[model samples]
Target chain A: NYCNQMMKSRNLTKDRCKPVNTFVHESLADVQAVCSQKNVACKNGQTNCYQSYSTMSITDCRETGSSKYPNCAYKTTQANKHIIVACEGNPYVPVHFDASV
Target chain B: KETAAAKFERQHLDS
Candidate 1:
């Protein structure tokens, strides 16, 4: 339900969702501690895996993940207007919208 | 530029 609209637009199955990485708060020690509990690693064909904390912002994190079960390369970006998520592998597709939170 | 009407007329004439 979280991404139902997106899945419909791309004609994709929810089963294709894969966890590539996670990003979390930069300042909160406890939050980061909790996030670290999930020790998920990058599978093969994925590279330059790292989690970055937004030093300039508070309680913000950016995770580079992809739904590449169909061999797709995707990137997610959060900006002022909307969150723009794009894919480059297979057929290129672009999706954008306001943040859920 | 060709007008829509003109194009339509030309196409009709050619046919």
Candidate 2:
């Protein structure tokens, strides 16, 4: 519902559509709290990722191969998992969604 | 050690 609009508004709708992503179903404050949780290496080997303290409900969006320009097709999946995100800012908040571990 | 937030800001936010 609002997720689609939220993603678009967040500047994530860039030149090419994002391949795969996840959104945690929790308050921004709770998501921000993850910055102080267990640190982990991102799949790309970056050390800026952190795992959530507890499992969270999340919506996963994966773009299908058939997805084309200006008409992206996404497969939406909902599940509960431990989320990982990249944080930034002095009052660190999630900036990039890394994965769900 | 650099904090997680600083690391992300350096790599992602910085152009």
Candidate 3:
């Protein structure tokens, strides 16, 4: 199933490529429901959710219809995962989950 | 551009 597993890598590398993330118990309604309850803001006026680390901001947001079409735009792969909403104008600074690495 | 997630999910493996 497209929403379930990665099977091609097993054919090429003869090794299963584990998914880095999962949706778990998430849905578009869940995101909207939770977000609506709080006044969370996205970076740079982007219509996405935001998470703040020590010196970075992360997001789990998507475009207007992303929930209806996950493959159409960039969005967080998981319900609780924090993705990069926008880098703070810092080139060479790749967004990461933590300060390490 | 096609992405890693799309590659695995979009590629036809089973129907």
Candidate 4:
């Protein structure tokens, strides 16, 4: 659902989706470990962000040139890259994928 | 932009 459609009830939307978004293929456990990598500022100026020290397997999704609403078109591309995420809560786990570069 | 309130859950939540 994250890469396919929009859901206002959950604050999800394609209009707000990045043209070059990626979906990581790692376990949540490893992802949460990033939160322990020291804090950093997020893209939105939000705090509690942590970056992965190593690249991980990720499947990227990209919209086509003629993509449109009702059915936004995208293709899945696999690759490996470092990931950044925002963490929250007592467990200090990832709550968002901030970026990958 | 989407809040990512559930994006992480939906995209990376393999727990």
Candidate 5:
């Protein structure tokens, strides 16, 4: 339920759609707090990326081979790790996911 | 230099 709504709202649903993505299972405030942590370069070389200071609970979604529109197939896995995300806007909320540390 | 993304792929996906 959460994954479906977030993937759509986050703009991850486009073109053929993303093959893999991750979502932090923490509260919005906790995730937003990461913006004040260490700055890092995103996978795409964007300088607006930030890393979480501590390990966070996160859910990873990997697309299955038979995945299709409106019926995206995914293998969900839970993990705990330091996450990296790209921030934007005046208040610097996470806008792009980079990777996990 | 190793990047955060590269390290992530190595530790998580390269297994």
Candidate 6:
């Protein structure tokens, strides 16, 4: 129930199955503000990415083997790390999450 | 090579 609620509120769950998903324990304002942090190279070699100024709380949801579509398939794993994200648009907001370190 | 859109989806906005 918790996972479903968190995933939905974050808009991570979609119409189709998602093998994996992750969410930051932070406000959308804070996450979007990361776009103005230190710039970094993205995993895909893009240059517009930025890394967070500090480590933040995070959670990863991985689908277990026995889990089927639209089920309690995700296992929660908590983490604390800096996030890397790609920024775009005139206002400079995070458009993608690259990685965490 | 993976497209930006695909990678974006794979990673999701926060994945």
Residue A101, candidate 2: Cα error in Å is 1.1
Q: For residues B1-15, could you state the per-residue lDDT of candidate 1 as single tens digits?
A: 955333322211111
For residues A22-98, what per-residue lDDT tens digits would candidate 4 score against the true structure? 56777767777788985778999988788788998887667778766655666666778888888887777677788
DockQ, candidate 1, vs. native dimer:
0.01
Window of ten residues with lowest summed lDDT in model 4 chain A: A5-14
Fnat of candidate 4, please?
0.38
Residue A96 in candidate 3, Cα distance off native in Å: 18
Q: How far is A29's C-alpha from truth in model 3 (Å)?
A: 3.2
Q: Which of the two, 5 or 6, has more TM-score?
A: 6
Ranking, TM-score, top scorer first? 6, 4, 2, 5, 3, 1
Q: Candidate 6: DockQ?
A: 0.17
* Docking level for model 1: incorrect
Residue A38 CA displacement from its true place in model 1, Å: 17
TM-score (chain B only), all candidates: 0.55, 0.60, 0.43, 0.38, 0.69, 0.56
lDDT of 3 by residue, A1-101 (tens): 32322323224212433233222232323222332232234544543333333221212222334223223222343233333322222221212221110
Question: Which model is ahead, 1 or 3, in terms of lDDT?
Answer: 3
Candidate 5: chain B TM-score against the reference chain B: 0.69
Candidate 2 lDDT, tens digit per residue, A1-101?
43344445445554557676566667656777898999998889999889987898877777778977566567777788898887667777877778786
Candidate 5 whole-model C-alpha lDDT, 0 to 1: 0.69
Computed on alpha carbons, the lDDT of every model, listed in order, comes to: 0.27, 0.68, 0.28, 0.67, 0.69, 0.72
Instruction: Indicate the residue-level lDDT of A81 in model 1.
Output: 20
DockQ, all candidates in order: 0.01, 0.09, 0.07, 0.35, 0.04, 0.17
Identify the candidate with maximal lDDT.
Answer: 6
Model 1, stretches more than 4 Å misplaced?
A14-41, A45-47, A55-101, B1-15
Model 4 spans with C-alpha error above 4 angstroms: A1-20, B1-7, B13-15
The local lDDT score (0 to 100) that residue B3 gets in candidate 2 is 69
How many clashing residue pairs are found in candidate 1?
0
What C-alpha lDDT, on a 0 to 100 scale, does residue A21 get in candidate 2?
A: 57
Better of 1 and 3 by TM-score: 3
What clash count goes with each model? Answer: 0, 0, 1, 0, 0, 0
**lDDT at A31, model 1:** 27
Model 3 chain A, TM-score vs. native: 0.23
